[PDB]
């Protein structure tokens, strides 16, 4: 979800309703966890670029003073804006930052590549995956770990040729990304290493989380797009 | 009638849902926006902030240098409203786009985030 107001939140499909189509050149999420392939897909017609973090961002947030001339430049390059964010959190007492820039026009080709991998896979196959082989990128309170590195998940399920196609599409979609060696998670008061990093997370369905999968299937557009 | 500002190169809206524990940081972030939003840096564009704090109603702000000082100008004081309602967000965007037309628009979405997860995800775990 995004945006807390009292008890009320915007679910990702509600956020898409709040945004006009084809108006914004970019959306910058100053928020945790929004560089999610599902979220970028849901919002693909709301911006040409989405600049966001796949993990948690320190509460100090983005360095708006330094970003400002870059945000208003004639030659707007959001990779520069993301670099300003990243470089801020370097040799810092909390040197923990992840960022990616997604070019939304390339998401349809990416969707097709993923569909050709996932649509014929069974849930038992997905549930069987060894989590130690995939980079976990989310440690929300009470979570057993739901969001993993997108590349690592797909790598467990693709043939060599399918994987090569996926990487070609992924590199066209994620046009800039950066990460510090570790990412800090508030619900564990620790930073953990990032061993593998593509810039986006994905849901890894788990047998123990059937209610989560049910909600995902009905409310997150990416599910029907690539699993069916 | 309200007369729109002269069209420009870019309008950026920062939509700050800070009716939560991030309150103090929204204010520090607005400070940093003020430091950066000089006439030279805004390059002719508009910086608009929808600020929804805890404890008081939302406000629409324009950040703009006038007479050598970057000002945080109150445009609108809203009544209490649900800033997480998509129709409220759309309405605010519409106010902004209408009054500050541009060749390019950007949006900063500022708040807590949890990816696609349902906001009641804790109820869907056990």
């Amino acid at each position: 979800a995004f945006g807390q107001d009292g008890n009320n939140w915007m679910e990702i499909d509600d956020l898409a309703k709040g945004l006009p189509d084809d108006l914004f050149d970019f959306i910058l999420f100053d928020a945790c966890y929004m560089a999610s392939v599902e979220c970028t897909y849901e919002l693909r017609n709301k911006a040409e670029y989405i600049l966001a973090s796949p993990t948690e961002t320190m509460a100090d947030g983005w360095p708006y003073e330094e970003m400002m001339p870059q945000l208003f430049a004639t030659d707007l390059q959001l990779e520069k804006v993301g670099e300003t964010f990243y470089n801020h959190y370097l040799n810092n007492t909390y040197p923990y930052a992840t960022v990616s820039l997604t070019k939304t026009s390339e998401l349809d080709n990416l969707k097709s590549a993923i569909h050709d991998i996932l649509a014929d896979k069974t849930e038992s196959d997905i549930y069987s995956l060894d989590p130690k082989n995939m980079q976990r990128l989310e440690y929300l309170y009470r979570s057993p770990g739901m969001l993993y590195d997108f590349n690592d998940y797909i790598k467990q399920l693709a043939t060599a040729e399918q994987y090569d196609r996926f990487i070609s599409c992924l590199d066209k979609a994620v046009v800039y990304k950066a990460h510090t060696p570790k990412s800090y998670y508030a619900a564990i008061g620790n930073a953990l290493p990032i061993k593998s990093y593509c810039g986006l997370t994905i849901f890894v369905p788990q047998e123990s989380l059937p209610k989560m999968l049910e909600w995902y299937k009905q409310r997150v557009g990416w599910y029907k797009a690539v699993y069916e | 009638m309200e007369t729109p500002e002269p069209r420009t190169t870019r309008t950026i809206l920062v939509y700050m849902m800070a009716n939560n524990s991030l309150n103090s940081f929204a204010s520090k972030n607005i400070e940093s926006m003020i430091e950066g939003a000089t006439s030279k840096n805004l390059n002719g564009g508009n910086l608009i902030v929808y600020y929804a704090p805890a404890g008081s109603p939302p406000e629409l702000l324009r950040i703009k240098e006038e007479n050598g000082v970057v000002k945080k100008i109150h445009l609108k004081d809203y009544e209490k409203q649900n800033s997480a309602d998509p129709d409220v967000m759309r309405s605010v965007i519409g106010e902004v786009v209408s009054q500050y037309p541009a060749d390019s628009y950007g949006l900063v979405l500022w708040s807590h985030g949890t990816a696609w997860l349902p906001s009641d995800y804790q109820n869907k775990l056990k």
Partner: peptide, 4 residues
Amino acid sequence: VLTX
């Protein structure tokens, strides 16, 4: 320290 807080995160977002």
